[PDB]
Amino acid sequence: DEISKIIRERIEGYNREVKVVNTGTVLQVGDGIARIHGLDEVMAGELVEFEEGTIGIALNLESNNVG
């Protein structure tokens, strides 16, 4: 019924890493498409670049993830 400070803080710590504002963590890659969890502020057609330098276009924006 109640959450301890340690529990709330622990939960928040995990959230901050993933609620990084400009970035999004790859959910699944395949056949030339990446699905990305996150990226709440991207606009359709905005170039997004992953680690190791590949550049991609966010054609599909969906509530769950961005293709």
Binding site: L27, Q28, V29, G30, D31, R35
Partner: protein, 109 residues
């Protein structure tokens, strides 16, 4: 070869192989499955990591017959795509998909 994943699905030729969460093979790596034959002797059936599926499992299309494979067997990731022997010792041999010589003559260098 230090990464071990367990087969999760076999639907026809396409396997789904669940790996430890940090370490997953890249696309087009060769998985090699520690499967066993009708004799019980270990047999290896190679797979290709076609696509990363999320929830720490890949989707690989096996290069040999998936009949006899079990959900839950060990799958080692070789860390590279299929290396095929090339050169002088490949001349006049007859070869597999995997580069294994198929003409009953002594092994290709």
């Amino acid at each position: 070869k230090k990464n071990l994943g367990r087969i999760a699905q076999i639907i026809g030729p396409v396997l789904d192989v669940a790996f430890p969460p940090g370490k997953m093979p890249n696309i087009y790596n060769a998985l090699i499955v520690k499967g066993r034959d009708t004799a019980g002797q270990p047999m290896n059936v190679t797979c290709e990591v076609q696509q990363l599926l999320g929830n720490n499992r890949v989707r690989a299309v096996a290069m040999s017959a998936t009949d006899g494979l079990t959900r839950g067997m060990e799958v080692i990731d070789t860390g590279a795509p299929l290396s095929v022997p090339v050169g002088g010792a490949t001349l006049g041999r007859i070869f597999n998909v995997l580069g294994e010589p198929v003409d009953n003559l002594g092994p290709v260098d």
